[PDB]
Amino acid sequence: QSQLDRERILSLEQRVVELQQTLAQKDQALGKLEQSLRLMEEASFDGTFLWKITNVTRRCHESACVSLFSPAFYTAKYGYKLCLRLYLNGDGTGKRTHLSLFIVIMRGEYDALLPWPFRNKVTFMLLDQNNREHAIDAFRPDLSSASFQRPQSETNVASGCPLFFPLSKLQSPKHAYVKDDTMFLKCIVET
């Protein structure tokens, strides 16, 4: 009677530990359901996307001493799926000069019905928040690069403007590219 009541208390201990672990993976299942919902909210479907970057100097320091991806957006509800990739202290020819800003073609659930290569011309803006003089760059994709044909990974490799904006000019009194430690980047894809 004694040792059997002991075995019962011990299987209760094991069933409590087990419930603790099942509870943990229902919580992160809940987590990325939450993120699924967030990317639904942040997403645009007209080919204009606006990227609010908070805590700006913190992540610039951390870039100095790595790369950020935007929430996904779309050229149309049934068009191309894109996101942005931002190097706060630069990449490529702008390894430490500039903000380096690229588009990433992602694989969309309808890629079978769209033209390949992605040819759409892309316009990037760093928004001046007090004046209206935004810093603007633009390009048409280098045709057929493995950045721009149809993805067989969930993202192609990024392509764009590695010298989109130099860090020196970033906090000049003449503009407000950063305000309250926040920067706004705007991307316009033509449809």
The residues of the shown chain that bind a copy of itself, judged by CB under 8 A, are 5-6, 8-9, 12-13, 15-16, 19-20, 22-23, 26-27, 29-30, 33-34, 36-37, 40-41, 44, 46, 50, 52, 77-78, 109-110, 112-113, 127, 129, 179-180, 182, 184
In three-state secondary structure terms, 15 is helix
Question: In the chain, count of helices (H) and strands (E)?
Answer: 2, 9
Q: Which of 38, 121 has the CB closer to a copy of itself?
A: 38
Q: Which of 14, 66 has the CB closer to a copy of itself?
A: 14
Q: Which of 44, 145 has the CB closer to a copy of itself?
A: 44
User: Please, what is the minimum distance in Å from the beta carbon of residue 137 to a copy of itself?
Assistant: 19
User: Please, what is the minimum distance in Å from the beta carbon of residue 188 to a copy of itself?
Assistant: 12
CA torsion sign, 55 to 46 to 73 to 80? negative
User: Please, what is the minimum distance in Å from the beta carbon of residue 166 to a copy of itself?
Assistant: 21
CA distance 60 to 93: 18
Locate 144 and state its tokens.
């057929």
In three-state secondary structure terms, 102 is strand
Amino acid present at 154: E
Q: Which of 7, 66 has the CB closer to a copy of itself?
A: 7
Q: Which of 13, 154 has the CB closer to a copy of itself?
A: 13
Nearest to 183 by CA among 81, 99, 102: 99
Instruction: Please give the span between the terminal C-alpha atoms of the chain, in angstroms, as a whole number.
Output: 77
User: Please, what is the minimum distance in Å from the beta carbon of residue 51 to a copy of itself?
Assistant: 11
